[PDB]
Structures are given as structure tokens and as C-alpha cells.
Design a protein around this ligand. Structure first.
Ligand SMILES: CCCCCCCCCCCCCCCC(=O)O
Length: 110
């Protein structure tokens, strides 16, 4: 069945369809890891080109690792991405700015 974190992926993708082609910001290949408790359970890819979010693992310019519990939390902007990671409760690797671009987009989701 469909889980909570699932809605997140759908939200992000649906949000990408908003960004009009007459004015873009920053699009690139991102990586999303869904760890359950401490170990990975699946891979996720951010198709910023086709404007979709599929499940896959590849060498992306920016790697973002987060647990399911955090998927729905951050995805819905329920908790602060800064504080969340500040407590070493999240592992992300990539250009601060790059990840900072999706920060203001988190709210767009519900
Ligand atoms: C900082 C981590 C937050 C992750 C969850 C928020 C993801 C929001 C998705 C927005 C992607 C970037 C869209 C703007 C680029 C463009 O299409 O021109």
C-alpha cells in the first residue's frame, strides 16, 4: 500500500510542474535515500529534467539522505531542515546552495 513518505515524492514532483519554463532557477540531478531506522531501504532520484521523481540510485551532483520519518516531516515542511540536521539526525552531502534551493520549495508541499 501507499505510505506517508510516498506523498512527499509526489508533492515534490507535482511542484516541479509549477516552475514555468519562461523562468527557471536551478535544475540538476539529485539523490534521495530512504533509510529505515539506520540502514537504507531504497533509492530515489529527482528527475528535474523531465519534472518527475523516480526511484533509482546514481552518481548525482548532490546526495540527500533522510529517513522515512523525516521524509514526511521535511517534505511537508513540518520540521526545520536546519535544526533537524543540526542534531546530526540527517546525513546530506551536496552544495549548500543547491540544497538551499529546495528549502523555500518545501512549503509548496503539504
Ligand atoms: C533542502 C531539502 C528539501 C527537500 C524537499 C523540497 C524539495 C522541493 C523541490 C524543488 C526542486 C527545485 C525546483 C526549482 C528548479 C526549477 O524547476 O527551475
Amino acid at each position: 500500500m501507499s505510505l506517508k513518505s510516498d506523498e512527499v515524492f509526489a508533492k515534490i514532483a507535482k511542484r516541479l510542474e509549477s516552475i514555468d519554463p519562461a523562468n527557471r532557477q536551478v535544475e540538476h540531478v539529485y539523490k534521495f535515500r530512504i533509510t529505515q531506522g539506520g540502514k537504507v531501504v531504497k533509492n530515489w532520484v529527482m528527475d528535474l529534467k523531465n519534472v518527475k521523481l523516480v526511484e533509482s540510485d546514481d552518481a548525482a551532483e548532490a546526495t540527500l539522505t533522510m529517513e522515512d520519518d523525516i521524509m514526511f516531516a521535511i517534505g511537508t515542511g513540518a520540521l526545520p531542515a536546519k535544526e533537524a540536521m543540526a542534531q546530526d539526525k540527517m546525513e546530506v552531502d551536496g552544495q549548500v546552495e543547491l540544497i538551499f534551493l529546495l528549502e523555500p520549495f518545501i512549503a509548496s508541499l503539504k
